[PDB]
Amino acid sequence: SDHKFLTQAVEEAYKGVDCGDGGPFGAVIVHNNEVVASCHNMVLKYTDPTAHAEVTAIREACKKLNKIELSECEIYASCEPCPMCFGAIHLSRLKRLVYGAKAEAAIAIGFDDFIADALRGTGVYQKSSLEIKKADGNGAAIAEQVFQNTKEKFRLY
Amino acid sequence: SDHKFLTQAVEEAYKGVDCGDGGPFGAVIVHNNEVVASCHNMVLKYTDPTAHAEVTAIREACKKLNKIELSECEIYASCEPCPMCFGAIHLSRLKRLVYGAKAEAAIAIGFDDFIADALRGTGVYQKSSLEIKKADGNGAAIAEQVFQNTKEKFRLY
Numbered sequence A, B: 001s002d003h004k005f006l007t008q009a010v011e012e013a014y015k016g017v018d019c020g021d022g023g024p025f026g027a028v029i030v031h032n033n034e035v036v037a038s039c040h041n042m043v044l045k046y047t048d049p050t051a052h053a054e055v056t057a058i059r060e061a062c063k064k065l066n067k068i069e070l071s072e073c074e075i076y077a078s079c080e081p082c083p084m085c086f087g088a089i090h091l092s093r094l095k096r097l098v099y100g101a102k103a104e105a106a107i108a109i110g111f112d113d114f115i116a117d118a119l120r121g122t123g124v125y126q127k128s129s130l131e132i133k134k135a136d137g138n139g140a141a142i143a144e145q146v147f148q149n150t151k152e153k154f155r156l157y
């Protein structure tokens, strides 16, 4: 199940970078094995720098479920959430986060050196008790290769 | 300059709680003393936990200026931006942030202890070069009074 939804997030990343909707990032929000939202970066399509994959998925899931809290839901991110997106995940009350690639893979192709302290447990003020799973093995390898695979299909923002 | 726009953000907070749109928070994005966006919390209105005043203002200013970066603009927040909104401010490339009330003022009336390390200078993985101004004197008094005045006039989230 973890592999299935992380794979879906990776496919969302590829599909979005191929749509021109934005960067190669995907996010899937699940409610007891039922997919609530399946999204990718929409920064370019929406002219919205907050329209990240995780934020877009949170917005869609909350609108679909008619509630501002997703405490019975989990989020699968193709790449490690940035500070903004991790803050959005915290505010969403999502109960579990599974991400595929480390932020360094996105940074290696020119993305912002923009990493969430609360995710890595390196903050003074911002804490996290959110359940966080770093994927390993096959799905992790695929998610990390996402960025080397899609460097030509888009220009960074 | 700063006091007028900070007071407009505070007025946005009051209007938002009066409308039931969300919590007592406002944000005003300006470009050389010209307001590009004036917003408040829309979390309850939009059923969107990311619809913070700062995020909403960034969305609307990016729509108005037809671009995803606001490097020529400044943002006034009635209260200290949370980690999500500070990440959004970083991503939007806003060149200056002026905030009125410290996050403790919002915490003292029931909001989460949810503070951005990068804003306060305690970040390790997230570093901001943004010019940040904490308001003093009358602006600080107004912004802090927001939370005493709006106590139990809105639903918490």
Ligand SMILES: COc1nc(N)nc2c1ncn2[C@@H]1O[C@H](CO)[C@@H](O)[C@H]1O
Residues within 6 Å of the ligand: A022, A023, A025, A026, A040, A041, A042, A051, A052, A053, A054, A077, A079, A080, A081, A082, A085, A102, A103, A104, A106, A107, A111, A112, A113, A114, B091
């Ligand atoms: C769209 O969904 C996204 N998801 C993630 N996770 N990151 C994204 C992103 N869009 C841009 N980025 C940048 O990638 C690094 C984060 O690792 C930071 O530099 C981000 O600004």
Ligand SMILES: COc1nc(N)nc2c1ncn2[C@@H]1O[C@H](CO)[C@@H](O)[C@H]1O
Residues within 6 Å of the ligand: A091, B022, B023, B025, B026, B040, B041, B042, B051, B052, B053, B054, B079, B080, B081, B082, B085, B102, B103, B104, B106, B107, B111, B112, B113, B114, B115
């Ligand atoms: C919508 O506009 C907002 N702006 C800011 N800055 N904060 C907000 C907020 N809505 C709720 N909050 C909470 O207040 C604390 C941050 O000081 C945290 O707990 C936040 O979740």
Ligand SMILES: [Zn+2]
Residues within 6 Å of the ligand: A052, A053, A054, A081, A082, A083, A084, A085, A086
């Ligand atoms: Zn993000």
Ligand SMILES: [Zn+2]
Residues within 6 Å of the ligand: B052, B053, B054, B081, B082, B083, B084, B085, B086
């Ligand atoms: Zn915020």
